[PDB]
């Protein structure tokens, strides 16, 4: 295959002339940025690209420019193509290890200036932080080397090729290679130099190459620690090294974007508060171990760091080079079958985070990563998984300083090998305890393929060696969804060899033959529970714990039942929590023609929008945050379920339990919200609790002072006493008022003072109800009681299929008889409607009786629905009424859950209170679907301009409601596609189906499903 | 179910006062065609249609005309709705023997002339 | 790109592959066969060229151009190790096509197999036995 | 604002394009002039500040665009443009004047005109369709 270059089709050709991986440290004095505009041309395939050994700057100079770093599928006017989204399926044909012959090739060129003295003073390198997919590198028309590994870095020695004056850098970047097969993450396919490029100037005669810092406790009691520092110095012309450790800065340090990103050093005096010094002697080992007296522990809840300075010192006694960094005193162990930090068996309150920006893709500005992490901290998160590759090297300091438990993951996914198998065998579902047998059959292609060993090891070596000095990383992960094979064992051996201090994770290795931890994704409770019991022996001992590296798939409206997962986490020592998939929707900003408008609008793209041959549609839109990285109701719900303090109010008591792993409750201010005065709560250690007698209904736990990236007054946890349903003390007018009743041929009319009620007997439709200047009417298409909702992402694979199959959207109300009688116990009239509510083409339906009892200032509506007939659907999306609100309609107010939307299995973050529609920013979904329902509603007030309010409540049980003007949500692909009526409607529902996580994971749990059954409910429509 | 007329929901009510079926023979001398334009109005359901026992020609005369024979879903500009295609599935809900309450009702009217001798002959 | 012999021009009608397999599904194709063909991405067959050999003519021929490639749809293993041999004469072009089916997870059948050529502007009619 | 301050004037009249350089210092040499009716470039001599040229052409629409990336602007960025004035042409819609019978009802309040494919109702009280 000579029409495709050898190096693009050779899995062993992982790099040529790349320097060995070392621990990353940014130094302003050494790093010179080569970012900015570069000459650039795109070619169909490598053979059309120029021979770089003959490319002048004079020739390249004439090309268009592209800015580095950036992806070439994300340019002004899509100049160099568009993004491609695939989940599993490869976007190329499988012919391992060959890439396609047609293989987009981008050539980059720029120059840089070099001094006469610079070449004398410094060893010169080029460092690339990330280039997709692979590249060859040339300096001054000379071939330097080659590299693979898209999210790994690379350094190259440039000293031989460098000249005084103008220097030419040319980089040939290829989109596909043998490497593509192991880079099949569920994400956008994007190419180019998408991360920083730097020119490094290291001191020539001698310089610091690598550093290794470990903190190990000497003792079973986790007090005194050994700090080990190993330095690899390159060259002879040095005398010794100095080490200075500084007094710690408590994890409660205040940070902001500005101070986290500050990169200044050189003349800035690092620290002064000296704690420990040490010096090496001439001609001796440039490494040492020192005993440290009861140091401050580093933890994700309290990320206390000891700054240090390491100086390489010459014979004359001057400082040749310095490294300024930090130590985090912490130790991770597998202890009594648990992942343990500092002797403590931790809980992951985690999330999976890809590199994504709605405009820049995987070229994420640090500013934006900081934005992500602050937001996480604000929503109670304590752990991050680098799904499924290392991030920009500068991110890891952010984890260190803000405090996250981090799973750093190798850049290796092999998922695509499964797709033809999935299709050939018509595979419908995969399950965590059973699915590895499906991956076993295709492992031989890559993960069990000896030709790929060097590549797999390189992903491992590169992962560990770059990030080995970050205390926040506690687990190395071998990648994601790459089946299981000999290469994984090889990776495991190497990692334990390189870094004995951390644990190894790999979900594809079901039995953890070469991993230290068990890991499931999206398991049912039954499946979690079987696994536990099969790995807990007779003594109650287990050898390894279980985490959920992915659970509670956050796609669209959802996830449901985070509650039930959390109950399981706290209950068993065997479970150590999990990470939600995923942090944010991967939407790309683009211009969409609106289905509602015929006009162009800003929207967020997923599969299909960039017109891919093959794509996986909306599956990229599965985050707790939207494409713009802002909180969805999913994240709001997550913050509540994972709250690190439990507050329970019952029996004239507040019980407070500290659910943190390490820190006390001392930094929190507990407020009695009914009085506004603080509650004196004793200092509680992890797992301690106190019961305090109080008359309170609502207690909040809030931050006393600014700490970390959180502000004084920030809400960590809260609790409420359960609120009984109180019937509002509305006064029904039962005074004897004469009423004009007209039971016509088709229409029945009830007129009184301040009242006009018209019902269409043929349809069961309220033509008009006008009471005291306020008007409503039926929003009618087929039936007065409707059942349909716009399917959520979770509804799509099954529930929607069922509901559509049973024609639930086409429910018809066929009127049999209407009875009209004069009022009795104070009422003006009683109108009773007898009908069958049933969809076309089906037998099943409800024998329905709707009784309207009409008062001067109130309408009582009693609904009886009796399910009849063969071949019934299992469940419904909802059941309730739809009313048009009159032109006067202006706002609404309700007692119930708020301020945002709530659903049966996604409601507990929305506390009880009185809420005003005006105070709430309604959430817009990136993919339009069911939204804006309010569950457990006690009463609803609808305000009409200059006519007071209409109060609505359900007898004996709280209800559900939505108020909007939207329609066409089903067909709407993007927010801008959503149609809007010229007036508002009320969706008044007795019940609503749960939300679940079935797009990927368990169905709506049984107790949240709106099961097919009889319905009986009474509403009052009380007019002021 | 009094909002749907008895005869529309009674399988045994196959006809009222229809003459017994006989072998068909066309005879020019006996058959007089009543095809052509007829007064016509469409109603949502039977209850909106006029009581025919009180409908004058003077009243019906004023309606639009449709041409007999023809389907009312196949008119100029789809004036009276459009055709519906189903294979197996009923286009209505199943509640044997009830039809839907909303049940398109077309009323046709025309006149014809009779002789003094004709009624005798 | 172009074949122009004695005032007559043809060229490949090319989108992905020089040998294509797809047809617009019939009503009969729709319930099963179409489902299968779509599942196996037969409409997305790609020709990936490995080598092209060029030699001077021998037994009266002007030139022999041999094309070695894999014809395979995206996302799948299955495909044909293909050899296309063009023997070029002054007034004739002989095209020998060898297609060898390879790989796991194969479709049961194809809608068709063959070439697609653009006819030159001169094209006016056809006649066949 | 970008239009009124454009640093090059392009005027199209009488089968001619007159191009005047309205910069203060730079020539027009960095600009590519495109005849938008054909898509082919117009060869325009290098014009100094305040210099102009008349070029005979059939064109209706001429654009002045950047040849190469320069400063913070990209190749193909539009600096200036000009159009010949477009006369108002009556579209060649064909009115149906064939004798079709029409039902006209001039009622008490509403007037109705019904024909094949047509239904026109006007409220006489309001002047409202
Ligand atoms: O949202 C679907 C997710 O499914 C998981 O199994 C996988 O590890 C993720 O990378 C993503 O594809
Ligand atoms: Mg995947
Ligand atoms: Mn859209
Ligand atoms: Na992918
Ligand atoms: Na636990
Ligand atoms: Na996804
Ligand atoms: Na939608
Ligand atoms: Na039918």
Swiss-Prot record, chain A:
Family, per entry: Belongs to the glycosyl hydrolase 2 family.
Protein name: Beta-galactosidase
Record key words, sorted: Glycosidase, Hydrolase
Organism field: Kluyveromyces lactis (strain ATCC 8585 / CBS 2359 / DSM 70799 / NBRC 1267 / NRRL Y-1140 / WM37)
Assigned EC number: 3.2.1.23
Molecular functions (GO terms): beta-galactosidase activity; carbohydrate binding
Signal peptide feature range: none
Catalytic-site annotation from UniProt: 481, 550
Catalysed transformations (reactions): Hydrolysis of terminal non-reducing beta-D-galactose residues in beta-D-galactosides
Protein's UniProt keywords contain Hydrolase: yes
UniProtKB/Swiss-Prot annotation, chain B:
Similarity-based family: Belongs to the glycosyl hydrolase 2 family.
Protein name: Beta-galactosidase
Lineage of the species this protein comes from: Eukaryota, Fungi, Dikarya, Ascomycota, Saccharomycotina
Gene: LAC4
Complete-protein stretch covered: 2 to 122 of 1025
């Amino acid at each position: 295959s000579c029409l495709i270059p050898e190096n693009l089709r050779n899995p062993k050709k992982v790099h040529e002339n790349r320097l060995p991986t070392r621990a990353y440290y940014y130094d302003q004095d050494i790093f010179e940025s080569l970012n900015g505009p570069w000459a650039f041309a795109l070619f169909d395939a490598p053979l059309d690209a120029p021979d770089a050994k003959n490319l002048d700057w004079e020739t390249a100079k004439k090309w268009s420019t592209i800015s580095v770093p950036s992806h070439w599928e994300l340019q002004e006017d899509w100049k160099y193509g568009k993004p491609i989204y695939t989940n599993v399926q490869y976007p190329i044909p499988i012919d391992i290890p060959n890439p396609p012959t047609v293989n987009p090739t981008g050539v980059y060129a720029r120059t840089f200036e070099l001094d006469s003295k610079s070449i004398e003073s410094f060893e010169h390198r080029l460092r690339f932080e990330g280039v997709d997919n692979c590249y060859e590198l040339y300096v001054n028309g000379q071939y330097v080397g080659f590299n693979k590994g898209s999210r790994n870095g690379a350094e190259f020695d440039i000293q031989k090729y460098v000249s005084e004056g103008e220097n030419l850098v040319v980089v040939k970047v290829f989109k596909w290679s043998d490497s593509t097969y192991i880079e099949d993450q569920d994400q956008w396919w994007l190419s180019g130099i998408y991360r920083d490029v730097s020119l490094l100037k290291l001191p020539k005669k001698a310089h610091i190459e690598d550093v290794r810092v470990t903190t190990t406790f000497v003792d079973s009691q986790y007090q005194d620690a050994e700090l080990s520092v190993k330095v690899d110095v390159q060259g002879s012309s040095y005398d010794h090294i100095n080490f200075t450790l500084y007094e710690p800065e408590d994890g409660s340090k205040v940070y902001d974007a500005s101070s986290l990103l500050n990169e200044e050093n050189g003349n800035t005096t690092f620290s002064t508060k000296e704690f420990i010094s040490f010096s090496t002697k001439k001609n001796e080992e440039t490494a040492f171990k020192i005993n440290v007296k009861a140091p401050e522990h580093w933890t994700a809840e309290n990320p206390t760091l000891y700054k240090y300075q390491l100086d390489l010192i010459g014979s004359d006694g001057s400082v040749i080079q310095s490294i300024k960094h930090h130590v985090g005193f912490r130790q991770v162990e597998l202890k009594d079958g648990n992942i343990t930090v500092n002797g403590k068996d931790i809980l992951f309150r985690g999330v999976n985070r890809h590199d994504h920006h709605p405009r820049f893709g995987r070229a994420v500005p640090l500013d934006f990563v900081v934005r992500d992490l602050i937001l996480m901290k604000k929503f109670n998160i304590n752990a991050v998984r680098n799904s499924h590759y290392p991030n920009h090297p500068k991110v890891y300091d952010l984890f260190d300083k803000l405090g996250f438990w981090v799973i750093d993951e190798a850049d290796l996914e092999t998922h695509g090998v499964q797709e033809p198998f999935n299709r050939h065998t018509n595979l419908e579902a995969e399950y965590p305890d059973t699915k590895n047998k499906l991956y076993d059959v295709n492992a031989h292609y890559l993960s069990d393929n000896p030709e790929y060993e060097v590549a797999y090891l390189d992903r491992a070596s590169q992962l560990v060696l770059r990030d080995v000095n970050h205390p926040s990383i506690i687990i190395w992960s071998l990648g994601n969804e790459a089946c299981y094979g000999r290469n994984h064992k090889a990776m495991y051996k190497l990692i334990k060899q390189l870094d004995p201090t951390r644990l190894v994770h790999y979900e594809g290795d079901l039995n953890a033959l070469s991993a230290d931890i068990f890991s499931f994704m999206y398991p049912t409770f039954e499946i979690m529970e079987r696994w536990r019991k099969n790995h807990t022996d007779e003594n109650g001992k287990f050898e390894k714990p279980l985490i959920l590296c992915e659970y509670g798939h956050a796609m669209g409206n959802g996830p449901g039942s985070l509650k039930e997962y959390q109950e399981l986490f706290y209950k068993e020592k065997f479970y150590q929590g999990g990470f939600i998939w995923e942090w944010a929707n991967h939407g790309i900003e683009f211009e969409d023609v609106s289905t509602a408008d015929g006009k162009l609008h800003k929207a967020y793209a997923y599969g299909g929008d960039f017109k891919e041959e093959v794509h996986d549609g909306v599956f990229i839109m599965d985050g707790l945050c939207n494409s713009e990285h802002n909180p969805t109701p999913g994240l709001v719900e997550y913050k509540k379920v994972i709250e690190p303090v439990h507050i329970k109010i019952a029996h004239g008591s507040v019980t407070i339990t500290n659910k943190h792993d390490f820190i006390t409750t001392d930094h929190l201010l507990f407020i009695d919200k009914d009085t506004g005065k603080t509650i004196d709560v004793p200092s509680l250690k992890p797992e301690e609790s106190v019961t305090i007698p109080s008359d309170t209904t609502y207690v909040v736990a809030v931050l006393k002072d600014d700490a970390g990236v959180l502000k004084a007054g920030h809400e960590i946890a809260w609790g409420q006493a359960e609120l009984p349903l109180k019937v509002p003390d509305f006064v029904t007018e039962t005074a004897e008022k004469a009423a004009k009743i007209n039971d016509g041929k088709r229409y029945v009319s009830v007129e009184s003072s301040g009242l006009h009620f018209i019902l269409d007997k043929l349809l069961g439709k309220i033509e008009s109800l006008k009471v005291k200047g306020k008007e409503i009417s039926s929003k009618f298409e087929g039936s007065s009681i409707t059942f349909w909702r716009p399917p959520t992402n979770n509804d799509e694979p099954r529930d929607f299929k069922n509901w559509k199959k049973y024609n639930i959207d086409l429910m018809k109300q066929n009127i049999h008889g209407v009875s009209v009688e004069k009022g009795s116990n104070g009422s003006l009239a009683v109108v009773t409607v007898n009908s069958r509510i049933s969809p076309v083409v089906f037998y099943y339906g409800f024998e329905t009786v709707q009784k309207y009892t009409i008062f001067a200032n109130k309408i009582n509506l009693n609904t009886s629905m009796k399910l009849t007939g063969e071949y019934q659907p299992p469940d419904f999306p909802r059941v309730g009424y739809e009313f048009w609100l009159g032109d006067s309609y202006e706002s609404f107010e309700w007692l119930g859950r708020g301020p945002g939307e709530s659903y049966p299995d996604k409601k507990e973050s929305q506390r009880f209170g009185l809420y005003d529609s005006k105070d709430v920013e309604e959430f817009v979904y990136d993919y339009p679907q069911e939204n804006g329902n309010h569950t457990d509603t006690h009463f609803l007030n609808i305000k009409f301009e200059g006519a007071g309010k209409l109060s609505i409540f359900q007898k004996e049980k709280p209800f559900n409601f939505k108020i909007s003007d939207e329609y066409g949500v089903d067909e709407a692909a993007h927010a801008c596609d959503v149609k809007r009526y010229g007036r508002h409607y009320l969706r008044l529902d007795h019940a609503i189906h749960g939300v679940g996580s079935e797009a990927c994971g368990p169905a709506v749990l049984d107790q949240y499903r709106l099961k097919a059954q009889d319905f009986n409910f009474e509403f009052d429509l009380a007019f002021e």
